[PDB]
């Protein structure tokens, strides 16, 4: 029912690693500052994503038992989760309460940043759906760790070794859902269900990036490696 000393220790350690990310305000203040062109926005978002991947690798390395895993599986786990983790983080940032009309202005700037409407509509639908769950920072952090440590990922040699690392994190999250939301016994199921929804953003990701209304699609070498672009 309640968190054991080891579970409390695990949660606090995951939270410290997760808090090393760029602050939601640091991302929202840049966008909400001035009205930027599609060429400027693509450059702003490319830098944001490069930083996201950089901090994600550091967070991933800190996950208990990740260093003990086979080198090939480590790469496949990061490459297979990077996009999902970026959309989970983007959802956390968008749903952060801001002053009156600020979240609506942020939505407007992203919708008019150069991206095709075909990819925007399911993206803001997912952000608004995630928001409805009223997730805490601990749930966002644990859900990110669960996403990264998904054994049912492509090209993984030893699934069982990944299962053993994900299992305590699922147990911690399950306990937290029963604590923060005892009114809704389906809350944990909703979170896990949102992981399947996250997987849909993978297949057409490179397509969304190349269909951006910019003459030239420049990416950093790290993004090219993680997103399989250029």
């Amino acid at each position: 029912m309640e968190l054991t000393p080891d579970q409390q220790t695990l949660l606090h350690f995951i939270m410290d690693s997760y808090n090393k990310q760029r602050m939601p305000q640091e991302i929202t203040n840049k966008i909400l500052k001035e009205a930027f062109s599609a060429e400027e926005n693509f450059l702003i978002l490319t830098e944001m994503a490069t930083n996201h991947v950089q901090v994600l690798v550091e967070f991933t390395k800190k996950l208990p038992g990740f260093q003990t895993l086979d080198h090939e599986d480590q790469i496949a786990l990061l490459k297979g989760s990077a996009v999902e983790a970026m959309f989970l983080r983007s959802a956390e940032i968008f749903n952060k309460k801001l002053p009156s009309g600020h979240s609506d202005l942020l939505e407007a700037r992203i919708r008019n940043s150069g991206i095709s409407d075909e990819y925007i509509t399911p993206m803001f639908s997912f952000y608004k759906s995630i928001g409805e769950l009223k997730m805490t920072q601990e749930e966002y952090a644990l859900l990110t760790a669960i996403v990264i440590l998904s054994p049912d990922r492509q090209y993984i040699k030893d699934r069982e070794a990944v299962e053993k690392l994900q299992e305590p994190l699922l147990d911690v999250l399950q306990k937290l859902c029963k604590i923060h939301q005892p009114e809704n016994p389906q809350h944990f199921a909703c979170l896990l269900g949102r992981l399947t929804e996250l997987r849909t953003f993978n297949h057409h990701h490179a397509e969304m990036l190349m269909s951006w209304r910019v003459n030239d699609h420049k990416f950093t070498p790290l993004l090219c490696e993680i997103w399989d672009v250029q």
Binding site: K79, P221, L222
Partner: peptide, 11 residues
């Protein structure tokens, strides 16, 4: 090869 990702993982 994912040499940049492998480097960031080793260090």
């Amino acid at each position: 090869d994912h040499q940049l990702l492998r480097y960031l993982l080793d260090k």
